Every structure is written in structure tokens, then in C-alpha cells.
Motif scaffolding. Structure first.
Motif, PDB file in Angstrom:
ATOM      1  N   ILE E  36       0.888  -1.153  -0.228  1.00 42.00           N
ATOM      2  CA  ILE E  36       0.059   0.119   0.152  1.00 42.00           C
ATOM      3  C   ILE E  36       0.766   1.372  -0.062  1.00 42.00           C
ATOM      4  O   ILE E  36       0.620   2.254  -0.742  1.00 42.00           O
ATOM      5  N   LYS E  38       4.058   1.830  -0.812  1.00 47.32           N
ATOM      6  CA  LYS E  38       5.360   1.977  -1.600  1.00 47.32           C
ATOM      7  C   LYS E  38       4.772   2.776  -3.030  1.00 47.32           C
ATOM      8  O   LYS E  38       5.601   3.384  -3.743  1.00 47.32           O
ATOM      9  N   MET E  39       3.400   2.723  -3.412  1.00 47.98           N
ATOM     10  CA  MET E  39       2.726   3.106  -4.610  1.00 47.98           C
ATOM     11  C   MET E  39       2.734   4.664  -4.430  1.00 47.98           C
ATOM     12  O   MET E  39       1.793   4.960  -3.655  1.00 47.98           O
ATOM     13  N   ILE E  71       2.952   2.274 -16.547  1.00 44.27           N
ATOM     14  CA  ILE E  71       4.250   2.001 -15.418  1.00 44.27           C
ATOM     15  C   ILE E  71       3.698   1.688 -14.150  1.00 44.27           C
ATOM     16  O   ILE E  71       3.955   0.625 -13.733  1.00 44.27           O
ATOM     17  N   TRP E  72       2.665   2.343 -13.653  1.00 45.96           N
ATOM     18  CA  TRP E  72       2.268   2.142 -12.264  1.00 45.96           C
ATOM     19  C   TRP E  72       1.357   0.852 -12.325  1.00 45.96           C
ATOM     20  O   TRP E  72       1.191   0.235 -11.118  1.00 45.96           O
ATOM     21  N   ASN E  75       3.805  -1.917 -12.305  1.00 43.54           N
ATOM     22  CA  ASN E  75       4.416  -1.940 -10.791  1.00 43.54           C
ATOM     23  C   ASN E  75       3.469  -2.405  -9.852  1.00 43.54           C
ATOM     24  O   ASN E  75       4.091  -3.254  -8.906  1.00 43.54           O
ATOM     25  N   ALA E  76       2.474  -2.113  -9.827  1.00 42.32           N
ATOM     26  CA  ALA E  76       1.278  -2.637  -8.851  1.00 42.32           C
ATOM     27  C   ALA E  76       1.118  -4.412  -8.997  1.00 42.32           C
ATOM     28  O   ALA E  76       1.140  -5.146  -8.165  1.00 42.32           O
ATOM     29  N   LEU E  79       4.398  -6.206  -8.279  1.00 41.63           N
ATOM     30  CA  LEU E  79       4.416  -6.237  -6.765  1.00 41.63           C
ATOM     31  C   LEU E  79       3.703  -7.047  -6.035  1.00 41.63           C
ATOM     32  O   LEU E  79       4.100  -8.033  -5.175  1.00 41.63           O
TER      33      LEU E  79
END
Ligand code: NAG
Ligand code: NAG
Ligand code: NAG
Lengths: 197, 35, 105, 128, 104, 128, 105
Positions: E36, E38-39, E71-72, E75-76, E79
Motif C-alpha cells: 500500500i 510504496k505506490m 508504468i504504475w 508496478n502494482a 509487486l
């Protein structure tokens, strides 16, 4: 500050960013890796403590410590090499009738640096886990190597230790530590001491 | 006649952040950040 | 029977002061202590569980520390709504014993 | 919004049976990971633990009250009960029922919901 | 999550190991908290409009908005997938370290 | 900036005691992971190893010089010393002290500094 | 006593040439050879440690290879500052033996 010229480190929004290059610091009748770590071990990360007739002392395993150093150095080097954060040199100015391009420039500058902050922090924490598991596996593979060398000549006390059924001198202790050990030489004495116990 | 398999420990107070654990005290660590 | 000793049994402080309530154990309670707050005419609620960890709905003024026999409960600043009897409960054994209670005043 | 509701007699003769029930509303009593606990408090005195029950089946009772009291878990009617035998002068108390969770869980990684990890209490009933 | 089943003369029943389950909860809660925290996806509030003679800045704005979100998203998803795999190996190692404790 | 400085007598009679010391400056000698080594060189000849000492306590000597020489680690004074007994004509040599690290470490993942992993040497002292 | 045989003991080359210094082992030296270099009126320094790995402060011209009994030290291009005696030191055993020394000229 993000705006840097010259040969400069990359910018992240990090307060702390530390890589593990060692084991967990768990201090502490000298017993092995189940009870904890040895304060008197200093010449390496992994090693041995022998007790016999001649004397007692700690002896580090230089080969496994050297291979652990070889992976940990490459981990830190790949952390340095894989970061491709581009440097900001000037910072752009915009007038009153260019607010959309000003907000786009702020969005790019506050998006790329957030992405690279996340990437650097995530890489550091993931390889911190990989280092802390790699060291545990390196102690366990050393214990398994000494178990596979010693076989039925040794009685495990639990706690990462072996008690020899037969009698060993420094040259034997030094032989398990070295990769050469003569299992069929001490087999009959181990059988006689195992039948009595 | 005992031999044991152990590891390194010292007086270092370097604390790191793991994902599932925080402030893990480690024997050796490097700093990557200039402040 | 792990018998629980809690001191001081009578406590008095003003608004803004800092107090420390200490509960002592007979045997070894390994991070298995619950701190309770019984305000008069109200059911008790838990503030600290596992001897250090704040519960939900409990403000950050309360804090807990200790391991083994000795435990501490520190209120950082007493408010007028912090008028209650404080209890320590162990659950390391299968028989649970409450403290005798420290009533702040 | 799990709530515990207590129904008690309120008036019992000495050397009789004190039957208490604690009805769980808003949740299930047939969920593992909780101590379904009974705590009494003498008037003008402190809290005293009596017993717990768990949906696994474990029950633990006070060493002063091993043979006298019994605690049961009524799975079908969503409640747990405490029955006290040989009621004396010392048995009059403010009785609380509680749900003490096994684990400290603020996100519901075990419990499944964020309000599962909470220690809820009954408001209290008085027996004389 | 982890525990024991005993069979002997007196009775048989399941008993949970609350300490190993509590330490497993202590890592799994911190894993969810780190996922939660780190984003750092930045919020879009308005959406920019452009006229007919600003097509290059319009395409650049859609490129930035559809690059950062991709990109996000990556990344989510990465992860969550990696920490799912680490959770599923962590639970297996937590059962095996309990078995090794009872063996030792 | 760890430097190894040597103090020697410079003139010893035959069948006497050669007291050589090597003072470590800019660092600690009480750091594990190093061989605190003593190398001699005969004039117009090659390098010859004499002994090493570690902070653990490990000690080794040359097979030609097992009983004659001894090496000691002065932890408090931050130096290590070599004492040679029964000095002969062949003992007249250029003596070097060295810090040979255990591991190849250019980053200081073990040593802690990038300069820990470095093999440093004394400049040399001459005994006759 | 693991004895070091190092060849060729006398070597001569000009600026820009490439030479190869070979040090041979009696027993089996498993990547535990150190390559040394003393320039006249100067203390020795280590060039190659663990028989292949360049030290710090040492140029990339020097290179080391080999395992077991046979090892090689190759200088890619001799400069005028590469006028020195080259030694090989083993530390596999607890008794260390230096080489006899190869003086390039
Ligand atoms: C150590 O290993 C070597 C080769 O692996 C072997 O020749 C030697 O006998 C072993 N033991 C000792 C005490 O050197
Ligand atoms: C550990 O002890 C050494 C001894 O001098 C000291 O230099 C070092 O600072 C200590 N480390 C910590 C973290 O206290
Ligand atoms: C870790 O240490 C920092 C600073 O020492 C502190 O602020 C933080 O609360 C600690 N976290 C935990 C989980 O102990």
C-alpha cells in the motif's frame, strides 16, 4: 535536490537506503547456527568451532565467505548499474499563459522521480530479503556438507553441531573443514562407539 | 569431540528495512544514499 | 497460578502529567499481557495487546513495554477522560489472572 | 458491527443455579480464532476471570472455580452461556462476556475483516 | 495457520501454534502495508484541453498520461505477484521450520 | 590511509635477538580478516616468507624458521612484532611487514571500507 | 612444502612487447596464488589476487589465469615503468612459499 550538473548521484525521495552486506546480528557452551551467531567469529561470515583434546578455537570458512562476497558485490554493483535516472540540469521556466505546459513539466518531473524512487527502494528491499535468505542457505549448505561428509560417524546434538563417535585430532577437524575427509577409515570405530551408545 | 557450524555476529547496530520486517539489525551493511 | 502484582494501587495526577503503571508477574509472561481501561459505569476495553501493541480506537498517548516478569504502561499526558481503573491481564498460561487494579485520580 | 448482548436472571436464591447467556449479534460465534470469555467483577472490587470457550472446543476455567461453573458454546443459536452452581454471597458480581481474539490483527489477514481482530465486550449484567 | 494434532491415551484434538501464526501475521500485515505505502501514483484532477493547432502537445499529454498509468499498473501487478509468491513460499517454510523444530 | 611503519635495531651481533616491530597507523590491528605477515628479502636474492599472525590467534611460521622466530600481536599498542633468535649471517635481510587481507573485497562488503580490502606493505627495515 | 617453480627467471623485452610469466606448483593450488611486483628501491605490491582478479590501483594491462598446478601472468604491453621483479606467492597451505622471481629487462 533534483537539479544537478556534473558527475552526480541519481536523485531519489529516500530518507534511508541501505543494502544488507552481511548476516542478521543475533548474538549468542558454544553452539551453532540454531542458537545464534558467534561474537568470536571475526575472520569471516561462515565457519567452524572445534573442541577436542589439543585445543578449542574458531576457524572461519574462507571459500564460502569469498563466494558470498562474490555475490554480494555483484548485487551492489547491479544496484548501481541498473539505475538509469536522467539528470536535470536547468529547470524550465514558463510565463503566465503557459500553465498547461508548466503543469505537464511538473507532472513529468514529479512522475519520473517518483518512479525511480520506487524502483530504487523496491530493489533495495527485495535484495535485502535475497541477501538475508542467501546467508541462511549458505550456512545450511555448509551444515549439509559437514553432515554428508561425516555420515554415521557423528552424533548431532541438535543446534548446528556434531559429536564424533570416534576420536578426531586437529588434522581430522581440519579435514572436515577442508573438503577431504576419510569416511571408511573411521567407520569401524564409529560402529563400535555407536553400539556402546 | 564437538564441531559446530555457526556464523558471524558483532557489535554493529546497522538497521535495514526488509519488506516484512522493519529495523533488522545486521552485521555489515553499505550506505547508498548521500544526504 | 501466575499471580499478578500491579503498582501503584492508588494514583493521583493532574491534567498534562505523565504517569507509569507497572504490572509485575510471578512466572515468565512472554509478551502475553493485555492492558485494560475500565471507566466507571462502562465495560472494560483493551488498550495494549501483546504487551507493546496499541489496539484500534485507542489513542497514541498510551504505550506499553516490558518482557518477562516486568511490564510498564505509560500514559504520556493525562486528559480529564482518562479517569479509570487500569488492569493487567496475562494469557500466557491457560489460566488467566487479572491485576488488582490501579485507579488514577 | 458485532455486538454481545447478555441476558441474566438478576435475582437468585443462595445454593441455586445461576444461568447466564451472552448472545452474539452482528457476527458468528462459530468462527475460530477467538476466546469467548466470561469475566465477573465484584462490586467495589476488581475484575476476576472465570472461563473461556473456543469454537475448537477448548474451555478453561479459574482454579477457584473449576468444578462449580461450566461454559458452553451454542453454535446453532449464536450464543455462549455460563452456568454457576452453588451460588453464595461471593457470587454476586457484574458479569461481562467478551470476545478476546487469539491474534493481534489490524488488517484482517487472518480474521478476514478489519473488525475481526477487535476485542469486543458485553455491557454487563448484575446477578444477586 | 500452523499447528498440531495429537493422538494419545487421554484424547485427540487439534491445537494451533499461536506464536508462529502471530509472526506470520506480523510479516503478512507488513507486506500488505508495504504494498500500500510504496505506490506513489500522482492524482490527475482536471484533464487538459487543447485546440486544433496544439496537436503535438495534446499527443505528448496523452503519451505522459498513458505512460505513467501503464508504468504504475505494471508496478502494482508485479509487486502483488512477487509478494504473493513470497507469501506462498513463506508459509511453506514456516510449516517446515516448525516440523524441523519438533524433529530437533 | 592505513600505513605500516617499521622500527628495527639496524645492528645486531651474531647469536643474539633481533627485535623487529611494525606499527600500524591509520587503522586498527585488532580487525579480523587480515594476515599480519612478515616478509624478508636477502640482499641480491628473492623474497622469503617468515610468519603471519591474525587477531583470532592463528599463527604460522616458515618450516626453516619454526623454532627460531616468534610473532606477536600487540592489540593495545596497535602494532605487531617479530623476534628472531640466534641471528646468523643469513638472517641479514631486508624485512617487510604486510597486511594481507583474507578476501578479495573491492567494495567493503566484509571489510566495511573500500580501503579495508587492500594489501598494504611496510617500506622496509634493514638488519645486519 | 608446496614449492613454486617460476619461469623464465631472466626476461628481456622492449616497450610495447607482450610477455607471459608462468609459475608452476608442486601440489594443487586452487585459485590461491598472489602475483607480486617490486620495483628496485620499493616495497612489493600485489597485482593479481586469487590467481585471476586484478587488485585496486593496478592497471588493466596485467592479467592472470590458470588453476591447479599451472598459472600464467601476462603483461599486455610493457611500459618503461614495468621494470621490476615478479613473484608468485601461494597461500593454499598454511606454509607460504614465494617464487624465485622473474626480472624483466
Ligand atoms: C586438504 O586438502 C588437500 C587437497 O584437497 C589434501 O591433499 C590434504 O590432505 C587435505 N588435508 C590437510 C590436512 O591438508
Ligand atoms: C563496535 O566496537 C568498535 C571497537 O572500537 C567500535 O569502533 C565501533 O564503533 C563499535 N560499533 C558500534 C556500532 O557501536
Ligand atoms: C524503526 O526505527 C525508526 C527510527 O529508529 C522508528 O521511527 C520506527 O518506528 C521503527 N519501526 C519499528 C517497526 O520498530
Amino acid at each position: 535536490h533534483p537539479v544537478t550538473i556534473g558527475e552526480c548521484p541519481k536523485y531519489v525521495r529516500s530518507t534511508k537506503l541501505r543494502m544488507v552486506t552481511g548476516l542478521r546480528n543475533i548474538p549468542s557452551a558454544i553452539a551453532g547456527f540454531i542458537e545464534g551467531g558467534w561474537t568470536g567469529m571475526m575472520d569471516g561470515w561462515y565457519g567452524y568451532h572445534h573442541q577436542n583434546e589439543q585445543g578449542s578455537g574458531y576457524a572461519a570458512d574462507q571459500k564460502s565467505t569469498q563466494n558470498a562476497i562474490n555475490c554480494i558485490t555483484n548485487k551492489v554493483n547491479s544496484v548501481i548499474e541498473k539505475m538509469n535516472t536522467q539528470f536535470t540540469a536547468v529547470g524550465k521556466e514558463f510565463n503566465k499563459l503557459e500553465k498547461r505546459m508548466e503543469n505537464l513539466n511538473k507532472k513529468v518531473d514529479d512522475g519520473f522521480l517518483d518512479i525511480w524512487t520506487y524502483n530504487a527502494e523496491l530493489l533495495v528491499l527485495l535484495e535485502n530479503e535475497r541477501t538475508l535468505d542467501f546467508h541462511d542457505s549458505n550456512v545450511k549448505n555448509l551444515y549439509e556438507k559437514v553432515k554428508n561428509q561425516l555420515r554415521n560417524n557423528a552424533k548431532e546434538l541438535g543446534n548446528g553441531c556434531f559429536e564424533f563417535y570416534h576420536k578426531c585430532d586437529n588434522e581430522c577437524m581440519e579435514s572436515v573443514k577442508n573438503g577431504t575427509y576419510d569416511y571408511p577409515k573411521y567407520s569401524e570405530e564409529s560402529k563400535l562407539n555407536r553400539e556402546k551408545i | 569431540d564437538t564441531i559446530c557450524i555457526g556464523y558471524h555476529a558483532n557489535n554493529s547496530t546497522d538497521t535495514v528495512d526488509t519488506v516484512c520486517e522493519k529495523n533488522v539489525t545486521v552485521t555489515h551493511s553499505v550506505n547508498l544514499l548521500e544526504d | 497460578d501466575i499471580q499478578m502484582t500491579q503498582s501503584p494501587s492508588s494514583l493521583s495526577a493532574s491534567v498534562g502529567d505523565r504517569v507509569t503503571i507497572t504490572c509485575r508477574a510471578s512466572q515468565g509472561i512472554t509478551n502475553d499481557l493485555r492492558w485494560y481501561q475500565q471507566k466507571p459505569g462502562k465495560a472494560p476495553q483493551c488498550l495494549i495487546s501483546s504487551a507493546s501493541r496499541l489496539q484500534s480506537g485507542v489513542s497514541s498517548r498510551f504505550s506499553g513495554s516490558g518482557s518477562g516478569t516486568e511490564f510498564t504502561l505509560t500514559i504520556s499526558s493525562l486528559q480529564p477522560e482518562d479517569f479509570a481503573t487500569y488492569y493487567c491481564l496475562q494469557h500466557n498460561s491457560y489460566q488467566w489472572t487479572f491485576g488488582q487494579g490501579t485507579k488514577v485520580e | 458491527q458485532v455486538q454481545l448482548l447478555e441476558s441474566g436472571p438478576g435475582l437468585v436464591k443462595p445454593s441455586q443455579t445461576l444461568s447466564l447467556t451472552c448472545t452474539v449479534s452482528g457476527g458468528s460465534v462459530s468462527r475460530g480464532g477467538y476466546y469467548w470469555t466470561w469475566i465477573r467483577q465484584h462490586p467495589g472490587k476488581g475484575l476476576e476471570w472465570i472461563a473461556y470457550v473456543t469454537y475448537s472446543g477448548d474451555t478453561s476455567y479459574n482454579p477457584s472455580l473449576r468444578g462449580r461453573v461450566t461454559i458452553s458454546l451454542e453454535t446453532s443459536m449464536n450464543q455462549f452461556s455460563l452456568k454457576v452452581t452453588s451460588v453464595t454471597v461471593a457470587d454476586t458480581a457484574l458479569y461481562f462476556c467478551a470476545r478476546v481474539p487469539f491474534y493481534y490483527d489490524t488488517r484482517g489477514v487472518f480474521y478476514g475483516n478489519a473488525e475481526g481482530g477487535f476485542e469486543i465486550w458485553g455491557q454487563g449484567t448484575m446477578a444477586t
